[PDB]
Design a protein around this ligand. Sequence first.
Ligand SMILES: CC(C)[C@H](NC(=O)OCc1ccccc1)P(=O)(O)O[C@H](C(=O)O)c1cccc(NC(=N)N)c1
Ligand SMILES: [Zn+2]
Length: 304
Amino acid sequence: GHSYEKYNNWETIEAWTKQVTSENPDLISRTAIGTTFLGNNIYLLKVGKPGPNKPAIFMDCGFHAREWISHAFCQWFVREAVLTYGYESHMTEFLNKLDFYVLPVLNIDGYIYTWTKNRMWRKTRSTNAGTTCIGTDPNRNFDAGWCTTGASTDPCDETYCGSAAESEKETKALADFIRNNLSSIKAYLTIHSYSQMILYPYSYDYKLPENNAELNNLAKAAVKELATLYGTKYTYGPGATTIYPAAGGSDDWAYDQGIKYSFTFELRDKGRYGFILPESQIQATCEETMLAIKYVTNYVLGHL
Ligand SMILES: CC(C)[C@H](NC(=O)OCc1ccccc1)P(=O)(O)O[C@H](C(=O)O)c1cccc(NC(=N)N)c1
Ligand SMILES: [Zn+2]
């Protein structure tokens, strides 16, 4: 069964998307935006009070299979939204005024693989011509300085950029959806672990985004907000210099589509447990992360 303080396998997460939608008909709608290489449905949840011409924030989790706390966060977020709507003033305002598109798990095939075969799997599970090596790094697969730096052209490597940009059904589906909704999507938030950072563009080059001063101030405010709960310290900055240069990432691509608020979140911890973050830390991790996501949401709402 589904728990919010445990990591849930895909069958359970899928059942949950159907259940939470059924239980909250005027706050949540479910669609699928594509299928994975292995035929799983890429569900997207539209969270918000329906209305005409509403702006939106897009958030995805589970780009990378082994980053389990990411998947956990998208599920936590959805419950918080439906539990507190009508009671907590900010979330009530958020859901009245905008829609959150929440994509609980992008890389479903890899996630399943981390449950069944290899806890440390990262990439998708697509096949590659001329080799037995499996998978492409979805966050090297977007059309953003594609495969020029911090990526591999070898399918056997963890950062394989794929045979071409959007070669993966999963990344094509995500790009297609975002391209189809550019008029409404005002921010892009992509949830990863670990490192306790908020990154903004660019990672594929050392050039800075036009609005980098604003993004820096926004990230700064968001991390200090996060720290209020448990003292957790996040660093922040443009990807290339803050963590490492790397091309083909979705945050850079979304920004260059015109989504001016584009962030990669790296959640707990800083390496003690790394990707294998204890379930005992899910609640506290999600709780503090909510504060940063809500700060960003309120700021974006104030700049429409
Ligand atoms: C621990 C955490 C930072 C993860 N990093 C990771 O597994 O690094 C492994 C690795 C191994 C060899 C070469 C490069 C990278 P990840 O979540 O995969 O980091 C993102 C990524 O590399 O896709 C990441 C972190 C910060 C910013 C961005 N943005 C971007 N467009 N590159 C992307
Ligand atoms: Zn990641």
